[PDB]
Write an enzyme that holds these catalytic residues in place. Structure first.
Site, PDB file in Angstrom:
ATOM      1  N   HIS C  52     -39.050 -45.563  12.371  1.00  0.00           N
ATOM      2  CA  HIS C  52     -40.398 -45.777  12.892  1.00  0.00           C
ATOM      3  C   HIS C  52     -41.066 -46.866  12.067  1.00  0.00           C
ATOM      4  O   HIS C  52     -40.848 -46.966  10.872  1.00  0.00           O
ATOM      5  CB  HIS C  52     -41.345 -44.536  12.678  1.00  0.00           C
ATOM      6  N   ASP C  55     -42.241 -45.559   8.790  1.00  0.00           N
ATOM      7  CA  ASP C  55     -41.231 -45.197   7.844  1.00  0.00           C
ATOM      8  C   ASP C  55     -40.880 -46.390   6.895  1.00  0.00           C
ATOM      9  O   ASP C  55     -40.511 -46.190   5.751  1.00  0.00           O
ATOM     10  CB  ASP C  55     -39.903 -44.741   8.565  1.00  0.00           C
ATOM     11  N   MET C  86     -31.731 -49.385  16.574  1.00  0.00           N
ATOM     12  CA  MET C  86     -32.816 -48.778  17.296  1.00  0.00           C
ATOM     13  C   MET C  86     -34.020 -48.690  16.360  1.00  0.00           C
ATOM     14  O   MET C  86     -33.863 -48.492  15.151  1.00  0.00           O
ATOM     15  CB  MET C  86     -32.383 -47.366  17.825  1.00  0.00           C
ATOM     16  N   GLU C 179     -37.935 -40.418  25.305  1.00  0.00           N
ATOM     17  CA  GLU C 179     -37.473 -39.153  24.706  1.00  0.00           C
ATOM     18  C   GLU C 179     -38.278 -37.987  25.205  1.00  0.00           C
ATOM     19  O   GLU C 179     -39.450 -37.798  24.818  1.00  0.00           O
ATOM     20  CB  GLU C 179     -37.520 -39.224  23.241  1.00  0.00           C
ATOM     21  N   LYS C 181     -39.474 -34.007  25.469  1.00  0.00           N
ATOM     22  CA  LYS C 181     -39.552 -32.792  24.595  1.00  0.00           C
ATOM     23  C   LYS C 181     -40.465 -31.828  25.340  1.00  0.00           C
ATOM     24  O   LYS C 181     -41.493 -32.269  25.846  1.00  0.00           O
ATOM     25  CB  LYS C 181     -40.113 -33.129  23.240  1.00  0.00           C
ATOM     26  N   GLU C 215     -32.513 -35.396  23.317  1.00  0.00           N
ATOM     27  CA  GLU C 215     -32.196 -34.799  22.033  1.00  0.00           C
ATOM     28  C   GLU C 215     -31.716 -33.352  22.263  1.00  0.00           C
ATOM     29  O   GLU C 215     -32.352 -32.591  23.000  1.00  0.00           O
ATOM     30  CB  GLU C 215     -33.497 -34.726  21.161  1.00  0.00           C
ATOM     31  N   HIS C 218     -34.151 -30.519  21.939  1.00  0.00           N
ATOM     32  CA  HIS C 218     -35.265 -30.586  22.838  1.00  0.00           C
ATOM     33  C   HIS C 218     -35.013 -29.860  24.165  1.00  0.00           C
ATOM     34  O   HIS C 218     -35.813 -29.053  24.662  1.00  0.00           O
ATOM     35  CB  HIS C 218     -35.734 -32.007  23.119  1.00  0.00           C
ATOM     36  N   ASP C 243     -30.030 -38.417  20.724  1.00  0.00           N
ATOM     37  CA  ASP C 243     -30.407 -37.836  19.447  1.00  0.00           C
ATOM     38  C   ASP C 243     -29.580 -36.522  19.240  1.00  0.00           C
ATOM     39  O   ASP C 243     -29.775 -35.559  20.018  1.00  0.00           O
ATOM     40  CB  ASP C 243     -31.911 -37.567  19.372  1.00  0.00           C
ATOM     41  N   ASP C 253     -38.766 -26.279  17.279  1.00  0.00           N
ATOM     42  CA  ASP C 253     -37.654 -27.214  17.056  1.00  0.00           C
ATOM     43  C   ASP C 253     -37.200 -27.260  15.602  1.00  0.00           C
ATOM     44  O   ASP C 253     -37.998 -27.610  14.702  1.00  0.00           O
ATOM     45  CB  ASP C 253     -37.974 -28.641  17.559  1.00  0.00           C
ATOM     46  N   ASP C 255     -34.301 -28.778  14.238  1.00  0.00           N
ATOM     47  CA  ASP C 255     -33.692 -30.036  13.770  1.00  0.00           C
ATOM     48  C   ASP C 255     -32.598 -29.747  12.786  1.00  0.00           C
ATOM     49  O   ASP C 255     -32.413 -30.401  11.731  1.00  0.00           O
ATOM     50  CB  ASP C 255     -34.700 -31.012  13.218  1.00  0.00           C
ATOM     51  N   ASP C 285     -30.736 -37.112  14.677  1.00  0.00           N
ATOM     52  CA  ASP C 285     -32.177 -36.893  14.467  1.00  0.00           C
ATOM     53  C   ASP C 285     -32.338 -35.480  13.997  1.00  0.00           C
ATOM     54  O   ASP C 285     -32.431 -34.596  14.864  1.00  0.00           O
ATOM     55  CB  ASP C 285     -33.018 -37.224  15.716  1.00  0.00           C
TER      56      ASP C 285
END
Ligand SMILES: OC[C@@H](O)[C@H](O)[C@@H](O)CO
Ligand SMILES: OC[C@@H](O)[C@H](O)[C@@H](O)CO
Ligand SMILES: OC[C@@H](O)[C@H](O)[C@@H](O)CO
Ligand SMILES: OC[C@@H](O)[C@H](O)[C@@H](O)CO
Ligand SMILES: [Mg+2]
Ligand SMILES: [Mg+2]
Ligand SMILES: [Mg+2]
Ligand SMILES: [Mg+2]
Lengths: 384, 384, 384, 384
Positions: C52, C55, C86, C179, C181, C215, C218, C243, C253, C255, C285
């Site tokens: 991102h 980030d 990406m 994406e 969710k 994902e 998700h 993802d 979620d 992860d 992810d």
């Protein structure tokens, strides 16, 4: 991974005998004679079979038809060496039970459900069963005014207490195993989880006579962790029976073969049963999918046992691996098993290392190493 | 529907004080001084506030800062007439607790969690609290090897037993209320439901000292029926506290205001609390959504109480309506409250009307009239 | 099962860089410099990293600080041979986005979200990214009056259309991957599933520029079948990114690392990606659990790749096994791949074998042999 | 709140005609003659009825029995003034469909399913139906090898394309409405949500001929927001039919009467249908609980309509209330309906107020006032 009867695998007659009716579907298989099922299960290496009253004797049977049906069944048991470790009552299929058996709002129905149960307890004992399951699948509600739950729990306690008085009056050796389920076929079912059923049993007149019968998919269909609930049942000394199957998620109860569903939970289940030395039979309560013909029924049964035995090997290899044992110490599983304060309250209160001089930052910085541990677990499950 | 302090509505400091941090989001509101929250809640008609240790005294505070923080808080209580009926410990936020407090694998952490709890019990008592909540939000696991649950339950029992010895040693009047949650922030949390927590308490050394603190959204986030679980808690005599909020479904815990979420369950909850004469405060454990500014925080708090009071009126109107009372008899709710067999076992066994001469078809044909009943309930909830 | 960069495994900077903040928890790890993460991921055999905007460049950075941060990152890429396939925008963390980015009710916020996105598209292109992910984590609602969804979808289409005009205006080669969710951090998120996102893209001005970024967790956190949704994305030609992670159930979620969670679904996922010859990177992810220190972070990353490679081997062995190929024919997977009526409508209408003379009972009696098939699959996954 | 046929309420024959068979239960009611159901529904103020082929004509009927059954049904329609706006095919009950109709692995079954559909399209047209629903309840799988989804979607597209060619060849005015469901009776069903079904339709040869038929409980049993999915269907112009009922949560599909279940979602649904001026009939696809006798069946039907009409009044009062209209402006619902950048891309790029001079802190500090808004909504739903 070939089962032998020494592995104590058991099956309900209603498992392999499920004709494939569903909410939207007619039967896809013909009905099975119980005798055929005993023969085919014994050929696959099962140790025994279990039954509802209505699986063995057609509802409404004469005394003569009842005796005949039992005679043929016992001949098949004698022929195979199969055992009958457990029985149960059907208090759900007939329309009379549409609001419950033991907690039906109609009192007459409650009394009938008890008479029907006690008739089949006598038969279970005659066949050598030492466990009697009770699954109150119709105890509950779709709407909030229909069932005053405190009153229903009083009724439910009365019924179980009467059954305990009955078994004690007869001198029978049998114990009860109450089966939670969260929903399906009622909107919500009373005693929806292992915890609610454990809690209820300690209010009964003779708690020692009752334990739980958890089923894999039942806890899973509430999103709960089945190995965790089995651990609490074990901790309490109340695991009197288990129903093994698979479930993919929070949805309708699928009754898949054991191993299908949540495979990693199946691993952790078998690791726990085997590490605790659970002594009861490994009972499968599953439905071969209605897509299947009879060859597929027997293959699905065989797969139950095969998967159990593969997971038993992998879990044993995990626990015996010196790298795993090191990883468990790294993650302080040994410390989890040590008492927190065997020195006692006052000693804890006076221990400056527990408060005034505890370095919270240094303890927080210590990683738990759970990912290394779990990847070892994964590599052992996969044989990698 | 204006609350007065006589309605015994209470709020956690951490409710209206939630700054709006989430898994994906920074804070949207500044931190609230506890004094401001007491003043604003009292203006809205709340009766009292509750706290975690760390809500009232910043973690790591000196004795002098601790005394100051408590002094200012007590002045605000005195200023408003607000009460402090309940306190609890934060055993979840600091990284030291990342694997648990009372069930952390590290023994040193377990001992620290106990010392931290006991310090705040003393403070709770000083402030007049009669209930002490324990929410083991970090007790559990994300992976199966990380936590041997039987060992963790031994640890958990040890900790609660030590706390009971402590309160008894001091002569304090306080009781404990254990808060189940199924998951979040651990993958699975130990004591995941009301049932598991009821079951665990009857294994403690002094069970009378402990009950449950069920939270609406907690049971709902496992898909369970919250009024049903409250009824079982009531049936057992163990409802020592309640946390009120809303939840839309099996998903992350949303902590919506009470009434939002599953409104029909909120109706049936209030009908049950009021019909049973539950005597504890109506405590809201909710988060005003992070979309809101401070005006919205106070409006969300006000809405908690408003919705409770609207549902209380509608449930009372439902129960008092002669058409409802007739409908309840039509659906045999009266018969549900009668003992099944006060005549006793032998009398039941000898009663031909319960088996040999029970007309199962005539009983099955009798409809339960639950839809008429529930539509009456719906019309009363809607004011129709 | 050692990865090499030729396996095209990629990781977000925010994965291994997650500091462990949760709804109830402070950070358990210090922040990672992106340069360290590139170096450590490259050592583990990753092929690239993703980011991102926020980030790589602290929110609010000067031009000089932005250039410095990018320079150091590019040096680490050059040092390692890591790629950046990406990028994406953070439209969720800052409080300005509390009601959305592209669908925020405030128009000024919508416009800001677009400017912030376009700045980072330019940077993505400079770093060599060919895919741009958009995850509208704040697009949605907690209550029904707050968001008129038809209006929000108009806004959402406008935003994506403007981004497509922008990329076309600049001559950039980049494609967008939307994406879905279902929830978390909003009560309900717009475009909650792969299907809703596929449907939305075919209303955009230039659909060829957009695909989905499904994902694992998700789709699973809505109880959906992730391999099924990937198959529909593949069928549509719209799988532009994926993802990879794990999830245990319908809940928040989690992860988890890839392979953890629903292991059998992970198997079927890899079998599908590999059988379809999916050409995009295998992007993880995931969040290493906050229990872990930095050694555990890197072990969790390594485990992502290891599990992918083990499942790839087992799925390939399954498909190549002549017994499996026979079982697939037995279950008529070959017939599923044949057109139903290449003879055409009229030919079907005139075909008596399809109606007047179709033996429905004989077709119904043919079992599907799916249990034999699936037990072969299970034996191959387990290496049995 | 008395319905009249001018309210366009419709019911499936299989709704009030459900005999009460469930996974664990025999029928609790006798079968209803379609003629009786038309008469009783018309007396309650319904406008019309809908049917599966097999509801009106027993499977396997001769031409003479088919004509008789249709004649009696049309006489009841003529007698009452009831309409038949919609029909559908039963492609799920008979065992021949155990792996699907249009996506069955057996090609012969696929062709049969198409012939059976086309026969009933002709009958639907004869009875005046303008909508034809397709619910592929058996399209899907319990295990991952059993169904290659890309191949099944090719088959599914072929079937729908052939049906579109058929209707076009005949000059019929009828449109198709594809009904998603996530699971039950298959482990996972193809086209599991509104989004997946919208996405699939835009790949058909003649998309204008197809829309969706969302059902309340279907989206809810995946935890999705039903009003949101209806809004996306409306946004796309594809809402061709709707199925109204209630559902309590992610669990088996309960098919409760409309209003029961998630009452607040039912409110927001009706507000959306009415504000959008949805023109199709309000069709109830529900099952009166098997606890009920025939009086309860008709009361449950009546309650469907009553609840719709109560919610319609409350939603209209909400939208008309000047305090609500102010609250909507306070929450910037008006701004949500304004284009983000009607000034165009370049204008946005050059607008310093959108980036270089956007005060993000001042925008973040503005609360959304959603709690005041939603409490207004709650007060209007409750009539408070
Ligand atoms: O959900 C069905 C239950 O599992 C039953 O099969 C009981 O175990 C026995 O009646
Ligand atoms: O899920 C969070 C829990 O509800 C807490 O707020 C406890 O009630 C008190 O620590
Ligand atoms: O649920 C969080 C989402 O998975 C994000 O990590 C997006 O992929 C990228 O912003
Ligand atoms: O879940 C069952 C579906 O709702 C059906 O009733 C279809 O609407 C019509 O076959
Ligand atoms: Mg069972
Ligand atoms: Mg709480
Ligand atoms: Mg992602
Ligand atoms: Mg329907």
């Amino acid at each position: 991974y070939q089962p032998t009867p020494e592995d104590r695998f058991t099956f309900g007659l209603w498992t392999v005998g499920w004709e494939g009716r569903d909410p939207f579907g007619d039967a896809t298989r013909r009905a099975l004679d119980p005798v055929e099922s005993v023969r085919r299960l014994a050929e696959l290496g099962a140790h025994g079979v279990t039954f509802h009253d209505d699986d063995l004797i057609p509802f409404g049977s004469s005394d003569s038809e009842r005796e005949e049906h039992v005679k043929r069944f016992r001949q098949a048991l004698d022929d195979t060496g199969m055992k009958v470790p457990m029985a149960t009552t059907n208090l759900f299929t007939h329309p009379v039970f549409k609001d419950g058996g033991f907690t039906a709002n109609d009192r007459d129905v409650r009394r009938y459900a008890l008479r029907k149960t006690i008739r089949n307890i006598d038969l279970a004992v005659e066949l050598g069963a030492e466990t009697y399951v009770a699954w109150g699948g119709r105890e509950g509600a779709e709407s909030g005014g229909a069932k005053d739950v405190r009153d229903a729990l009083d009724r439910m306690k009365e019924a179980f207490d009467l059954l305990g008085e009955y078994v004690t009056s007869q001198g029978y050796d049998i114990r009860f195993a109450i089966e939670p389920k969260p929903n399906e076929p009622r909107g919500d079912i009373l005693l929806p989880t292992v915890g609610h059923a454990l809690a209820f049993i300690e209010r009964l007149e003779r708690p020692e006579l009752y334990g739980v019968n958890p089923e894999v998919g039942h806890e899973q269909m509430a999103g709960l962790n089945f190995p965790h609930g089995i651990a609490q049942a074990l901790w309490a000394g109340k695991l009197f029976h288990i129903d093994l199957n698979g479930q993919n998620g929070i949805k309708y109860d699928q009754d898949l073969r054991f191993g299908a569903g949540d495979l990693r939970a199946a691993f952790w289940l078998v690791d726990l049963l085997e590490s605790a030395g659970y002594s009861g039979p490994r009972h499968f309560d599953f439905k071969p999918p209605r897509t299947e013909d009879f060859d597929g029924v027997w293959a699905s049964a065989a797969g139950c046992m095969r998967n159990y035995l593969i997971l038993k090997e992998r879990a044993a290899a995990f626990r015996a691996d010196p790298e795993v044992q090191e990883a468990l110490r790294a993650s302080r599983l040994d410390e989890l098993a040590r008492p927190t304060a065997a020195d006692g309250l006052q000693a804890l209160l006076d221990d400056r290392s527990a408060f005034e001089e505890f370095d919270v930052d240094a303890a927080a910085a210590r990683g738990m190493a759970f990912e290394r541990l779990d990847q070892l677990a994964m590599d052992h499950l996969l044989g990698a």
